[PDB]
Amino acid sequence: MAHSPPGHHSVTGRPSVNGLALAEYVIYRGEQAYPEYLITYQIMRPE
């Protein structure tokens, strides 16, 4: 893995062109996330 920028713990990727796109986030240590919920699902064909 790579490192976060000096003095930081993560990166926020904030989309600047699509106004409806929400943020994406990057961490560089596995210990900084816990997989709390496991969700089983299907996508639905639009009506």
Binding site: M1, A2, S4, P5, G7, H8, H9, S10, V11, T12, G13, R14, P15, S16, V17, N18, L20, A21, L22, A23, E24, Y25, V26, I27, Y28, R29, G30, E31, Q32, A33, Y34, P35, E36, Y37, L38, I39, T40, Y41, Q42, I43, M44, R45, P46
Partner: protein, 162 residues
């Protein structure tokens, strides 16, 4: 050491998590190529992942980060889609779950949009789709996402053209 606890759809915690899935669907600029064409999900099951070792490993790092960021862990709940979900819930996140070619370097990536994470359940860019039908827009096969607790601490703000 991992236990999975089914939540009942009558439980407020199930409905809360379902609503987080459903409300953060968006359209994607690939027209559905990677993750398929949909506006909503059929939620089939929601399980709490319980692992004492992994949780204490997480909260130990959370406290370190908090103390380096004016007592603010900056903890979020974010989605993660991966072919390696079964390894992640038993062993935790590690470098083998990192996006080597990700836009912000080799790290572990999370999304506020559930539908963004849905693009990676079957592989990078959706891979070849579901294993049974080779269909990135399969409406039949069951998919799995993770809804994760994530410590951001002091987050470097990167304005990407996405």
């Amino acid at each position: 050491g991992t236990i999975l606890i089914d939540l009942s759809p009558d439980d407020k915690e199930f409905q809360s998590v379902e609503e987080e899935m459903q409300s953060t669907v968006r359209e994607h600029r690939d027209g559905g190529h990677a993750g398929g064409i949909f506006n909503r999900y059929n939620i089939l099951k929601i399980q709490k992942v319980c692992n004492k070792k992994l949780w204490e490993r997480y909260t130990h790092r959370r406290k370190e980060v908090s103390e380096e960021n004016h007592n603010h862990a900056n903890e979020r709940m974010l989605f993660h889609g991966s072919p390696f979900v079964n390894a992640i819930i038993h062993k935790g996140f590690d470098e083998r779950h990192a996006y080597i070619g990700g836009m912000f370097g080799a790290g572990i990536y999370f999304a506020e949009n559930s539908s963004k994470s849905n693009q990676y359940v079957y592989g990078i860019g959706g891979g070849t789709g579901c294993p049974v039908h080779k269909d990135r827009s399969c409406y039949i096969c069951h998919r799995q996402l993770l809804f994760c607790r994530v410590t951001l601490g002091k987050s470097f703000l990167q304005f990407s053209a996405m």
